[PDB]
């Protein structure tokens, strides 16, 4: 598991791997945002 | 307002509706 | 190249042959001349094949007691598994023959003159002045080809496993890829299946659709679907109809390529389960039970 | 400041191709994107670590990167088995703060800053079309990944040293002292054919020779930088290349995808640069150990599993036969030159090649989507696919992908380059200037 | 009138503010008081198998099927 | 209704019917 | 229990910061 | 009023004109067939998903409340015992009890039916709006086809074999039940009709990506044809060899592949019904018999088929009550 | 020691949180770098300062 | 199967030189307007 | 309200009980 210091911070790290489907999914949402120029 | 396309939305929505929280209800069912 | 005064160059490029052979046709015809002939030969003519290495002789030519349809040319044996297996190699020719070297020759012979095939797609679309994308579509096919020729050898490490080259043993690989990877359920093929059915349904809409606008279209099929139709424009459509079964037979053809590797479909057995603890059964395990049964009877050991 | 389809002919589904001529706009989304594959890097690191016991093997848990830092030789003692898990922890946390730098920048370059950078900054700007200064920024990154392959190699011999999965009594982190820089060794790799038994470069056997090849690769990468910085292409480089954004990332789309391919491949084979300890056994390597293991416990109570090869070696009896040009460490001591010997499977075998064998057969990686172990025709009991299956299959995936990639771009590179990329010229067409006859 | 229209407006959104909801929470009272099981005569996960059947149910009879059902399930 | 059978296929031909002439009735008050 | 509320939080907050970031744009300065 | 040749206005001539209104939807007077037996179809088949049981017709927990997915879950057949009853809501089993009747596998005949009907509504329908904008209902002669392959696979099948219980249950994992089903039954792999349905299948796919593939990339730069034949037909002369010199016949071959291939298929499912089955070539069964040497891969697709029938019949056919002991169910290692 | 590098982790949590609101908007709205570049570059500065002293509480502990 | 060998070695090499050659003769794409 | 809000909305509600649908597929029934 993650060091002890760092222990009650396993729920945070649990969602960081899937950011990157966010930031494409932030790319269309921002293009749906500017009515798809 | 009790339009064709009214009633064709409502008819495939409220089931649909119905259906969606049937089926959230039963994802956390027992066993 | 540059052969007398850049004849035999000219002559390669030429566009007036009545098939553009191309610079990639200078390897596709020789080896697909080279696939065709062996297979022609095998198939009519070959002794039979220890597809495994049990030495239980598989015959797949038609001398030997075969038809069209069960005709085939078997996989080369499980002993040579993904060696490299040229007639050079084998002791004698019928040896070669024997551990089903022609498979090997012709797969060979035979990716390499699709892949070639695309390359003179490119050339041609290059040499006419239009946009070169046929060869992209054409890589569909040319993928699954490849998947079950050649990334299926690889992942299970034997060229025995690849699809026989026949009708009768194409089911048997398909019998067999079932019951070890359980290929229905897994979501890749799922969709090559929706890509297949979705490619002759808009295939029939579009034949229909432009066979009755041609009296000498939008409105038909905007009052027939309720949802209307987004390609008003044909360039869509004709983009859509291109794009469906290509990516559903690329899906496909990566499915394979990833159960070549051990990664099966869906595994849903015992999914449901009673209040005790005893399975009830579905679908999912009556699947399964076919698939045990495929399984013990694949393994003739 | 995102423009529009009518001022760049691009549509939103074509978005980026608006990047092509905007070079500040473009480095900008070039460093997001690295950003976001260091963000990816350090957040499963931090997600396996988070989620990792290091009692298990590593291939039990499902973890892809852990293997990747442990080959390295990082908080791993002999016989594979984990001594911390600091080293993990500290990779995925510099990664995710250099993740954040390089988004800081990647935001930069994109949203505000010189969108051409041409004039500002003459070092930086590049036309596409300019062979030279592609040229200087190629040599740049060759220099880059000299360095990142000599860093390697520092690592392996000059540092704590490499996981050694060959070391005698199964593996350890060994100090790499005279990698193979044999010339002949190190291109026979490349001479090798792809085929069963040779295998190509995914048959390397030894630690030795990848850092020997590791050290060739650096020099000859620093070299080219260096030439490629002071050097313009030949004509003949000139003229058998399109030039343009497109045409190079053609090139690189199919480099890459034939890469990723080879990755594919020496994942679900090659088991030294991956090592079996973390990644778990090869296919042919589970198949071998189930042979073996059935071996040596039928004799604890020949012919039984053992038979002779086509070349005439000795070697494991059944369906493995297939697999038996698998080389493993816990099975290269009991075999001989003949191929398998019985004088070594009777008294050669040590407890630990019995139980490694033994974990490797309950591992196998056979597995399904739902991340289910065995068969498929297997109920649902166990939960594990090995992290071989999963890497080989991802990275084929995307290598098959971007081959097609490259068809697609490299297509629309020639087209563009001879005028073709709008489409057929409507007053006269090449097809209209040829002979009727087909 | 058009999708456009009818969704942008806030008149859609407060008028089924109210119902999307109450529907959502019939159906979730639909299934968690077991009304469903009730009605549509899927066995609960404890009454799969009785004391007196411990097999998967069959029933025989083609006319007289209503009362083998009832005998078969709980009832 | 000599059987329940009969009485309750009789039955299901008049709530067909009814059925009917409910969609024909809709039909004629909506055309205008 | 209070790990699986935490997640959730979080995961609602990742969500949140692009949507929050465009709305923003959207609304002030306008050049989104 | 308003018709032929002065003829007064009638009821017809007032719901003819309301039915055929250019509203958001066109309902015509084929829709009063279509959409409540189309809507009644799909509503059925999704309370079966979600709510009904199969446990009591196949012994089956099919459904997202008792535990299945999209994938698992299904509108199982009616048991064979109901033999072909169409159970109706009032037939004489499950005498209106709507639960009993669900129970009883009812569910699955009311999807089928209704859904058959909304297949004929919807075929109506495209002949009406073919008519409507006086357009040939080609759309209506391809659509055919699927009708054509639902009727011999969902009601003609199950009609010419014991009963219902061997109709394709609504459902992906039923589906695959089925098929499966055919393959080690029926061999129907090896039905020529089969052969000819799959290869037309596959033809249509090449088909559409090819004709898309090539109008895309013919198209010409910036009433008229937006991409030249002409280059087309150049290119595929001199690629594969043969090229569609008319556009008019191309889209006709593109109509007509996928229907005739699934016309075969539908073909080939009637001589299924009534077990009539390419299964068997009688001259290499004999061979394999007297030489145990001989083998192909027709005979192992056999031996497969056998393995099938023989471990999936202990639970797939519930009431025959099979009970294989573990001594003859077939095995690869017993041959 | 531990709670004093979980609070200051916990503040890294919320300056970055902070960063990703405002660097983009920041940079995007017009006029938006220019006369904020002040404020833009003392957050980076915070956050740098602040992993370091969280690597330096780690390393104490 | 030596013999065979040279031999098939020969033609491989020959049709690959070929392609390679030829693709390297082919003039380099250009537009004619610009 | 702003059309492409709408269907940010509409889309992250449809991933969130497509998360709870495939959460129910890995606990409770039909999870074995
Ligand atoms: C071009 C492809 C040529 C055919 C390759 C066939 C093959 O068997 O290639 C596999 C080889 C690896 O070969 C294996 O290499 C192995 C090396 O491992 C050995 O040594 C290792 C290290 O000790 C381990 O010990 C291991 O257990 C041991 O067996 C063995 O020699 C095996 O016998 C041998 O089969 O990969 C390689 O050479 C490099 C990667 C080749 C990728 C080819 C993938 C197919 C792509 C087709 C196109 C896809 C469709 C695109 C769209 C169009
Ligand atoms: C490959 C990526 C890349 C490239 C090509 C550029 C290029 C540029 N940037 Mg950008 N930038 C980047 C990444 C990049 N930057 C990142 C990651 C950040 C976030 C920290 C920034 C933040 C940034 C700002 C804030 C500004 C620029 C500016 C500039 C311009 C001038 C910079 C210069 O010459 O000073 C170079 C100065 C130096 C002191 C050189 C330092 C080099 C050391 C050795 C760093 C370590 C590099 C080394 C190879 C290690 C690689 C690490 C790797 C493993 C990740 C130029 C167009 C400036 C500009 O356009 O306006 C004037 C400007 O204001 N950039
Ligand atoms: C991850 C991959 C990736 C990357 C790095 C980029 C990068 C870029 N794209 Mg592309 N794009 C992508 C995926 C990607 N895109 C996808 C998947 C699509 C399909 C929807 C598009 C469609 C698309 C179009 C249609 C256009 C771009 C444009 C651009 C540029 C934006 C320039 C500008 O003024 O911003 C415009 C945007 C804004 C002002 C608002 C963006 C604000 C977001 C929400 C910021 C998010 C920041 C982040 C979450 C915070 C973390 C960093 C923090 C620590 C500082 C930039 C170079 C534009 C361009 O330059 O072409 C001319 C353009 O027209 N893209
Ligand atoms: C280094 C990689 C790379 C780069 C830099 C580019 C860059 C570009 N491509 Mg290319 N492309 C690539 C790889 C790459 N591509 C590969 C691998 C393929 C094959 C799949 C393609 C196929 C392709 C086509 C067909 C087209 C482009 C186009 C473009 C341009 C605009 C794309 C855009 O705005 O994004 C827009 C981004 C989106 C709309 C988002 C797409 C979301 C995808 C479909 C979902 C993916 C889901 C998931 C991750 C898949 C995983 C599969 C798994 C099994 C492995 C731009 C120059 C377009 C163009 O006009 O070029 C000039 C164009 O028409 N590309
Ligand atoms: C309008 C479209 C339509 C169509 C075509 C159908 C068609 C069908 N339904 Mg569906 N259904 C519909 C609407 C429709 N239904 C609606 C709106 C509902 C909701 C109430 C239902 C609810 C429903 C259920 C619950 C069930 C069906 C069933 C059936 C099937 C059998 C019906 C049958 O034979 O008895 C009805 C047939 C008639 C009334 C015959 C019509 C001929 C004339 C008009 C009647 C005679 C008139 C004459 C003048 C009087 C003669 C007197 C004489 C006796 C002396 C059939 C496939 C059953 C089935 O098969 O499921 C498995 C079933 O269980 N339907
Ligand atoms: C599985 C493959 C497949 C599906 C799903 C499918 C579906 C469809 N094709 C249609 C059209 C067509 N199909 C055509 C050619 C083809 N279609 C094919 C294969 C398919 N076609 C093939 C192979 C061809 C080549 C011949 C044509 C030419 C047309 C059209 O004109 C039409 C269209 O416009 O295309 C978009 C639509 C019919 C109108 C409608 O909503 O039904 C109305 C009637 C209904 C809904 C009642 C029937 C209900 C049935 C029995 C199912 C009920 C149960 C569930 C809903 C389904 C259970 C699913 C489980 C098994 C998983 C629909 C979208
Ligand atoms: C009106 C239109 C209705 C359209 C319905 C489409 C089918 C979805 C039904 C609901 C469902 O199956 O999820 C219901 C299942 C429920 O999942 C199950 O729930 C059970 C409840 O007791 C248990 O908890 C199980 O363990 C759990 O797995 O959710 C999923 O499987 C998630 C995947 C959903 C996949 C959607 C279909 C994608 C493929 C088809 C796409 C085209 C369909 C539209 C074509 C037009
Ligand atoms: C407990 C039930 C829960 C239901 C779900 C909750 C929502 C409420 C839904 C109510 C309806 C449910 C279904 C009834 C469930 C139920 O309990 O049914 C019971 C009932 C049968 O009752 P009996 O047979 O005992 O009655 C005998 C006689 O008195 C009447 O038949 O069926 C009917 O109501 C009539 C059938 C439908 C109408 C006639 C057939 C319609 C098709 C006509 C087609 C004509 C052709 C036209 C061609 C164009
Ligand atoms: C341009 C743009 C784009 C894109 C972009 C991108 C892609 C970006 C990226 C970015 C990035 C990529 C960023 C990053 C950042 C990072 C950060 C900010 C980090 C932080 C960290 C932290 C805070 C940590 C913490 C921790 C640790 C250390 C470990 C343990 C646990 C914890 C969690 C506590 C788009 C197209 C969409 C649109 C337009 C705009
Ligand atoms: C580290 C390593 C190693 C080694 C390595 C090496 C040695 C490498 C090398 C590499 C190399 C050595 C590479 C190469 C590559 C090449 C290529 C990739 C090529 C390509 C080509 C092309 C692409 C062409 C084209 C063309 C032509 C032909 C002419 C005309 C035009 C054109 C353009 C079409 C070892 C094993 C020891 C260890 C482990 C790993
Ligand atoms: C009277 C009657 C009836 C009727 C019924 C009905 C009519 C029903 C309906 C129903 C319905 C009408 C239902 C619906 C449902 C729906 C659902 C269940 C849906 C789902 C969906 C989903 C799941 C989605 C998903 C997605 C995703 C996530 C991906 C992206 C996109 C989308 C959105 C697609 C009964 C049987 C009672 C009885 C007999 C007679
Ligand atoms: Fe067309």
């Not at chain 8, 009907?117 to 329908?125: A, K, Q, S, V, Y």
């Not at chain 8, 192909?296 to 202990?314: S, V």
């Amino acid at each position: 598991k993650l060091p002890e210091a760092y222990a009650p911070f396993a729920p945070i790290v649990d969602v960081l791997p899937v950011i990157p489907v966010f930031f494409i999914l932030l790319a269309f949402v921002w293009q749906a945002a500017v009515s798809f120029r | 307002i009790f339009t064709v396309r009214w009633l064709a939305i409502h008819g495939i929505a409220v089931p649909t509706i119905f259906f969606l929280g049937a089926i959230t209800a039963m994802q956390f069912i027992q066993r | 190249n540059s052969s007398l005064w850049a004849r035999f160059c000219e002559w390669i490029t030429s566009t007036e042959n009545r098939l553009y052979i191309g610079w990639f046709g200078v390897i596709m015809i020789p080896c697909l001349l080279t696939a065709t002939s062996v297979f022609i030969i095998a198939f009519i003519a070959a002794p039979p094949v220890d597809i495994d290495g049990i030495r239980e002789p598989v015959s797949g030519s038609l001398l030997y007691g075969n038809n069209i349809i069960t005709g085939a040319v078997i996989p080369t044996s499980n002993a040579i598994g993904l060696h490299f297996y040229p007639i050079w190699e084998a002791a004698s020719l019928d040896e070669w023959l024997y551990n089903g070297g022609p498979y090997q020759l012709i797969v060979c012979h035979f990716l390499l003159g699709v892949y070639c095939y695309m390359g003179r797609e490119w050339e041609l679309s290059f040499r006419l002045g239009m946009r070169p994308w046929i060869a992209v579509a054409y890589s569909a096919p040319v993928a699954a080809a490849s998947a079950v020729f050649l990334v299926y050898p690889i992942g299970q490490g034997s060229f025995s496993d690849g699809m026989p080259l026949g009708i009768s043993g194409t089911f048997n690989f398909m019998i067999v890829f079932q019951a070890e990877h359980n290929i229905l359920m897994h979501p890749f093929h799922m969709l090559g299946v929706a890509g297949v059915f979705g490619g002759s349904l808009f295939s029939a809409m579009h034949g229909s659709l432009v066979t009755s606008s041609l009296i000498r279209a939008h409105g038909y099929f905007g009052r027939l679907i309720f949802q209307y139709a987004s390609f008003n424009n044909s360039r869509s459509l004709h983009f859509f109809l291109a794009a469906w079964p290509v990516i559903g037979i690329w899906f496909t053809a990566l499915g394979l390529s990833t159960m070549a590797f051990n990664l099966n479909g869906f595994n849903f057995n015992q999914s449901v389960v009673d209040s005790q603890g005893r399975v009830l059964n579905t679908w999912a395990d009556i699947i399964n039970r076919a698939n045990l049964g495929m399984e013990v009877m694949h393994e003739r050991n | 400041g995102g423009r529009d389809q009518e001022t760049t002919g691009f549509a939103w589904w074509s978005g980026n191709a608006r990047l092509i001529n905007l070079s500040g706009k473009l480095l900008g989304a070039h460093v997001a994107h690295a950003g976001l594959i260091v963000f990816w890097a350090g957040a499963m690191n931090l997600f396996e670590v988070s989620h990792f016991v290091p009692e298990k093997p590593m291939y039990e848990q499902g973890l892809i990167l852990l293997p990747h830092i442990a080959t390295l030789g990082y908080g791993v003692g002999p016989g594979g088995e984990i001594i911390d898990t600091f080293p993990y922890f500290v990779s995925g946390v510099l990664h995710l703060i250099s993740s954040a730098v390089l988004g800081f920048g990647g935001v930069y370059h994109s949203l505000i800053g010189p969108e051409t950078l041409e004039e500002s900054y003459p070092f930086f700007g590049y036309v596409w079309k300019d062979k030279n200064k592609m040229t200087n920024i190629l040599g740049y990154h060759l220099i880059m990944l000299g360095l990142g392959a000599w860093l390697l190699v520092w690592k392996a011999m000059y540092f704590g040293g490499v996981y050694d999965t060959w070391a005698p009594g199964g593996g350890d982190v060994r100090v790499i002292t005279n990698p193979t820089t044999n010339a002949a060794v190190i291109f026979g790799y490349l001479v090798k054919s792809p085929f069963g038994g040779d295998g190509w470069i995914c048959s390397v056997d030894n630690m030795e020779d990848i850092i020997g090849g590791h050290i060739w690769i650096g020099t000859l990468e620093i070299l080219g930088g260096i030439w490629h910085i002071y050097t313009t292409p030949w004509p003949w480089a000139r003229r058998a290349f399109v030039w343009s954004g497109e045409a190079y990332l053609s090139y690189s789309l199919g480099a890459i995808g034939v890469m990723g391919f080879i990755a594919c491949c020496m994942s679900w084979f090659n088991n030294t640069a991956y090592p079996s300890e973390f990644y778990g056994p090869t296919g042919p390597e589970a198949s071998q150990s189930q042979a073996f293991t059935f071996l040596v416990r039928d004799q604890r109570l020949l012919g039984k599993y053992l038979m002779r090869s086509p070349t005439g070696e000795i070697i494991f009896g059944g369906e493995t036969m297939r697999f038996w040009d698998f080389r493993g460490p816990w099975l290269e001591p009991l075999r001989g030159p003949n191929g398998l010997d019985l004088n070594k499977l009777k008294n050669d075998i040590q407890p630990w090649q019995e139980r490694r064998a033994a974990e490797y057969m309950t591992h196998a990686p056979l597995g399904s989507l739902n991340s289910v172990g065995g068969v498929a025709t297997e109920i649902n009991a166990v939960n594990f696919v090995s992290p071989r299956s999963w890497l080989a299959c991802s990275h084929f995936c995307l290598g098959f992908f971007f081959f097609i990639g490259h068809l697609w771009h490299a297509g629309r590179a020639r087209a563009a380059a001879a005028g073709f990329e709008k489409g057929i010229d409507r007053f006269d067409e090449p097809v209209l200037s040829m002979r009727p006859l087909d | 009138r058009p999708f456009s229209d009818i969704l942008t407006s806030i008149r859609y959104w407060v008028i089924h503010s109210i119902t999307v909801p109450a529907l959502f929470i019939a159906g979730w009272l639909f299934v968690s008081t077991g009304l469903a099981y009730d009605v549509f005569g899927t066995p609960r996960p404890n009454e799969y198998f009785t004391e007196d059947r411990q097999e998967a149910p069959l029933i025989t009879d083609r006319f007289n099927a209503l009362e083998q059902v009832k005998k078969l399930s709980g009832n | 209704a000599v059987t329940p059978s009969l009485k309750n296929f009789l039955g299901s031909l008049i709530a067909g019917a009814t059925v009917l002439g409910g969609i024909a009735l809709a039909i004629t008050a909506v055309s205008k | 229990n209070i790990e699986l509320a935490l997640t959730l939080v979080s995961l609602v907050l990742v969500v949140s910061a692009g949507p929050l970031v465009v709305v923003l744009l959207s609304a002030r300065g306008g050049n989104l | 009023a308003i018709g032929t040749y002065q003829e007064k206005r009638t009821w017809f001539d007032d719901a003819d004109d309301w039915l055929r209104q250019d509203r958001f939807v066109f309902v015509g007077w084929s829709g009063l067939l279509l959409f409540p037996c189309a809507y009644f179809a799909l509503g059925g088949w999704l309370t079966g998903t979600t709510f009904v049981t199969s446990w009591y017709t196949h012994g089956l927990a099919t459904s997202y409340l008792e535990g299945c997915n999209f994938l698992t879950a299904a509108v199982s057949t009616p048991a064979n015992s109901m033999a072909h009853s169409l159970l109706f809501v009032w037939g004489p089993e499950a005498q209106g009890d709507f639960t009993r009747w669900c129970q009883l596998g009812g569910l699955w005949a009311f999807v089928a039916l209704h859904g058959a009907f909304g297949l004929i509504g919807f075929m109506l329908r495209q002949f009406e709006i073919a008519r409507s904008v006086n357009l040939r209902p080609y759309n209506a002669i391809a659509f055919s086809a699927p009708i054509a392959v639902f009727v011999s696979v969902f009601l003609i099948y199950p009609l010419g074999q014991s009963g219902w219980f061997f109709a394709p249950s609504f459902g992906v994992a039923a589906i695959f039940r089925f098929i499966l089903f055919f393959q080690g039954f029926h061999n129907w792999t090896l039905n020529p009709f089969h052969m000819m349905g799959v290869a037309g299948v596959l033809g249509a796919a090449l088909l559409c990506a090819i004709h898309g593939a090539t109008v895309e990339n013919t198209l010409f730069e910036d009433a008229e044809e937006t991409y030249s034949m002409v280059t087309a037909n150049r290119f595929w002369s001199q690629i594969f060899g043969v090229a569609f010199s008319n556009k008019r016949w191309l889209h006709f071959f593109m109509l007509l592949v996928p229907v005739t291939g699934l016309w075969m298929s539908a073909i080939g499912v009637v001589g299924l019904a009534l077990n009539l089955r390419a299964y068997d070539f009688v001259s290499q069964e004999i061979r394999a018999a007297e030489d145990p040497e001989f083998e192909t891969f027709y005979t192992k697709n056999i031996l497969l088929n056998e393995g099938i029938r023989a471990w999936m019949a202990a639970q797939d056919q519930p009431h025959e009550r099979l009970v294989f002991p573990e001594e003859v169910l077939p095995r690869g290692n017993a041959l | 020691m531990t709670s004093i590098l979980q609070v200051a982790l916990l503040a890294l949590i919320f300056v970055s949180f902070a960063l990703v609101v405002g660097v983009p908007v920041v940079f995007a709205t017009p006029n938006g770098w220019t006369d904020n570049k002040g404020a833009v570059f003392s957050g980076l500065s915070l956050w740098l300062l602040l992993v370091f002293v969280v690597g330096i509480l780690n390393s104490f502990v | 199967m030596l013999t065979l060998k040279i031999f098939v070695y020969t033609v491989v090499t020959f049709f690959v030189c070929l392609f390679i050659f030829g693709f390297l003769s082919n003039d380099p794409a250009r537009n004619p307007g610009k | 309200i702003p059309l492409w809000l709408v269907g940010t909305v509409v889309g992250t509600l449809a991933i969130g009980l497509l998360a709870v649908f495939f959460y129910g597929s890995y606990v409770g029934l039909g999870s074995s």
